[PDB]
From a paper:
NarK is highly expressed during anaerobic growth in the presence of nitrate, and plays a central role in nitrate uptake, while NarU has important functions during severe nutrient starvation or slow growth. In this work, we demonstrate that NarK is a nitrate/nitrite antiporter, using an in vitro reconstituted system. The overall structures of NarK in both the occluded and inward-open states adopt a canonical MFS-fold with 12 TM helices, with TM1–TM6 and TM7–TM12 forming the N and C bundles, respectively. The substrate-binding site is located at the interface between the N and C bundles, in the middle of the TM segment.
Residue numbers in the entry: 14 to 239, 247 to 464
Write the structure that this text describes.
């Protein structure tokens, strides 16, 4: 539909470009925000499942939590490929729209305790599709902006997008105590304290908003007429660990924190507070990116990783052993530090990756001869392709962290096994980051 698109031309940006770009960003954001809601749905639902009569083991509950990152991580690169094929307009609507399927489904499944575990697996995997909308959403919205304004534009899209996790964790525990949707078949379950739990509401609540913004994408967003070899580059694989330790930890803690808290402090209503982790984690991401812009992303990343390690070590002192020899207040504080520090890490790592990967490619093609034009060109495309692939690999952390808790608990009755692996991982990361700093990035 839009065949003349010249965002770098000031006149064009004034008469038509900015208006168009602005409308597309402000439909993009709520669409992405909702996807993140759906992606992490089981982080609030699985804790409430035994409260409605389900008898799944602890590991099974963590698994339901973990799996949507597997399918999300898998579809991220296919999803980025989709937006040039079907256009940003129809694909945003569609990638938003289909999420009504798991939402609606989970609602009924949750009211029937004869629903097999297998059915929840399937739903869990379907929610994961929402994890892939990022790759697609981000790819798309960059085309609507000139180079000078893309950082701001992508920052806001991804930024507010990641907010979806904490807004879902915020309202899901609240709507779950109301008897709305009675006429759609919601049924309450009386709890020990005398109140009533409407678990269907946790997912059903997003259906009206999903539908509203599917429409908004279809009629409101526009289409604009305007990779393999990068896997061989070893630096991509090194960088992918860093993002996975940061972004993967943001998501992974988002998925597993509430379930873990219940296993460690069974008498705390953690869903009253859990949303605050992903909240500050999402805000930290943008702060991480801003600090990297001014200070250098590897420097920020390195310090952050050191904090990540320290804070993951402190977490052991907060735990009960075995009866109740622990402290929930310290446990929470520390996790907020880990949430914050993971989010910050997301942003510093992401910024660092694109910087390091641009200069590596620039220097390489210059070294074999080639115009500055061809140098900038191949630096552009390769980093774009590198960043997509990293962002896919990173999401795997969202599976590994809660799944590790689950296996740790099932095999030892303690989470200490899972936390030992995390600590080691962070330690290796500060070493890896120290390395690139000494090897590439100290000279900037
Ligand atoms: C002219 C072509 C018209 C094509 C219509 C496209 C409809 C898409 C949005 C509604 C999708 C379902 C939203 C409501 C689900 C509930
Ligand atoms: Zn190197």
């Amino acid at each position: 539909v839009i065949t003349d698109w010249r965002p770098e031309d000031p006149a064009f940006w004034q008469q038509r470009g900015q208006r168009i770009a602005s409308r597309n960003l402000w439909i993009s954001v709520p669409c992405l925000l909702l996807a993140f809601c759906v992606w992490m749905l089981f982080s609030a639902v699985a804790v409430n499942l035994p409260k409605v009569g389900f008898n799944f083991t602890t590991d099974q509950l963590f698994m339901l939590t973990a799996l949507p990152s597997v399918s999300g991580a898998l579809l991220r690169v296919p999803y980025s490929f989709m937006v040039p094929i079907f256009g940003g307009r129809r694909w945003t609507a569609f990638s938003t729209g289909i999420l009504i399927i798991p939402c609606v489904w989970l609602g009924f499944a949750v009211q029937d305790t004869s629903t097999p575990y297998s059915v929840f697996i399937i739903i869990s995997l379907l929610c994961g599709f929402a994890g892939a909308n990022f790759a697609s959403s981000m790819a798309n919205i960059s085309f609507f902006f000139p180079k000078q304004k893309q950082g701001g534009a992508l920052g806001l899209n991804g930024g507010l997008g990641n907010m979806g996790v904490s807004v879902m964790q915020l309202v899901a525990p609240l709507v779950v105590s109301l008897s709305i949707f009675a006429v759609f078949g919601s049924q309450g379950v009386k709890q020990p304290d005398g109140t009533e739990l409407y678990l269907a509401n946790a997912s059903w609540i997003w259906v009206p908003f999903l539908a509203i913004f599917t429409i908004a994408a279809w009629f409101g967003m526009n289409d604009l007429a305007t990779q393999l070899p990068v896997l061989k580059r070893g630096h991509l694989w090194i960088m992918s660990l860093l993002y996975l330790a940061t972004f993967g930890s943001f998501i992974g803690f988002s998925a597993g924190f509430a379930m873990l808290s219940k296993t460690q402090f069974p008498d705390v209503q953690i869903l009253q507070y859990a949303f605050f982790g992903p909240f500050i984690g999402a805000l930290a991401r943008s702060a991480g990116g801003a600090l990297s812009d001014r200070l250098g992303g590897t420097r920020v990343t390195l310090v952050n990783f050191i904090l990540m390690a320290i804070f993951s070590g402190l977490l052991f002192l907060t735990l009960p052993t075995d009866g109740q020899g622990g402290s929930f207040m310290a446990f929470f504080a520390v996790f907020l530090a880990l949430f914050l520090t993971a989010g910050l890490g997301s942003g510093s790592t992401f910024q660092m990756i694109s910087v390091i990967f641009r200069k590596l490619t620039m220097d390489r093609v210059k070294a074999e001869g080639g115009s500055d034009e061809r140098a900038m060109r191949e630096a552009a495309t390769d980093t774009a392709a590198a960043l997509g692939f990293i962002s896919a690999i990173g999401a795997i952390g969202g599976f590994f962290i809660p799944k590790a808790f689950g296996s740790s608990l099932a095999l030892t009755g303690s989470p200490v096994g899972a936390m030992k692996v995390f600590l080691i991982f962070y330690i290796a990361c500060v070493v890896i980051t120290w390395a690139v700093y000494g090897r590439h990035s100290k000279k900037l």
